[PDB]
Design a binder for this molecule. Sequence first.
Ligand SMILES: *CCC(=O)Nc1ccc2cccc(Cl)c2n1
Length: 462
Amino acid sequence: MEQPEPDMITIFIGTWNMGNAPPPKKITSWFLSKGQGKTRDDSADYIPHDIYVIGTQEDPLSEKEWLEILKHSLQEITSVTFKTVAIHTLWNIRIVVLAKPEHENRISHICTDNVKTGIANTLGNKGAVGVSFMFNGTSLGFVNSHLTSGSEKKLRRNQNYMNILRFLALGDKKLSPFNITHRFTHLFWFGDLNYRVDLPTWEAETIIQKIKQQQYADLLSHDQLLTERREQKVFLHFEEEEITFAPTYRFERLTRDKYAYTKQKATGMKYNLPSWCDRVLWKSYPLVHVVCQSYGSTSDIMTSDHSPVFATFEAGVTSQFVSKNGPGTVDSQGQIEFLRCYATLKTKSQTKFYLEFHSSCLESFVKSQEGENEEGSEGELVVKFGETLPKLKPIISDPEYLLDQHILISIKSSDSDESYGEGCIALRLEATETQLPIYTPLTHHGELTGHFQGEIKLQTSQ
Ligand SMILES: *CCC(=O)Nc1ccc2cccc(Cl)c2n1
């Protein structure tokens, strides 16, 4: 009588800087996506999300204490006893992953890790925790980061981001050229990112007035995370839902009627103008379904100087496919061919380069011959592969499997074997047996290093 495997799941993401205070007795509004912003319909209150991922900062509770509160809260809402997938804490930064009991046998390869940011003085409370796992055929990653505080420290926040994405060891370790920004079908990155509204301190009361009027436009135009992202300084190739809720920091505790922005000994004589510190971003592989269903803040949880933030997503997932052939052999009906491909690189290096193709649809990664270096008009390096690239042999040829897969590409130096650029190509093509354009930007350490473009021709069993 087996339940069919899902094609889509819903995921709840929560971030809350708890301000080193215990929570109030009731926090269900958080998990219901109720308050300000893009909120969830009342008619969905009893429908459980498939996965709940809860990130805290300045969390004063034990793992045991917080798990008990979380599981009781979800049982009250849904009448379901959720299973603990993973819990990991670095200092007072914590991530909890809970899942419906029906998903226990769909989840495998659970990993946790942390990154400590800063050196000496700036090492010891900021960094990130994360969790990854497989959900049937779909790889999921989750990062909760508490970045450097202070309105004048946006560059340090951007440096913290680059250290976390380089050093957090999640996902398939065989994907050696790839950082967490390429290892997952869906990656969610959330936390107290600590970016501020960059307006003069003497405009504090003006800002509060704007908030009371629910007029966020002239504040969001100065939000450091939106401006740094627009300038490609941080979170390149991530998405965020439009913000339609009030700044979530810095509140007087025990009400939400008052923003506490003035400099005090307790703040290091820093101002904390109202800001959207608490954020949820994501990055999914090309042409995979991901839709943000909610993004908002609670109004009734007041123990911290931050309000909790929620976001919910409908995310596409795939099945664990088994044919008569693969896994454990190739299906010769299938092939992936790359035609007239070239990489354009920002590097000044004059080494030869080769490609590596990594995918779950291959028995193991494939290494190309070296390309032929030319100079582009505007000074650049162009690495030409012609029709020289290997024919990739997928393990399963069924189009219902193969059209849902992705090929990770690394371009590596022949001299050093180091990646100069990583990217991802979807096989969700408009046509099979047809030459079609392909394209990915290439990044390294999450910054743009080039592009890969050319044509693909996909052979399936149909
Ligand atoms: C966390 C260490 C590790 O290697 N995890 C791992 C291994 C294999 C995987 C396959 C597919 C998806 C994921 Cl998330 C995997 N993670």
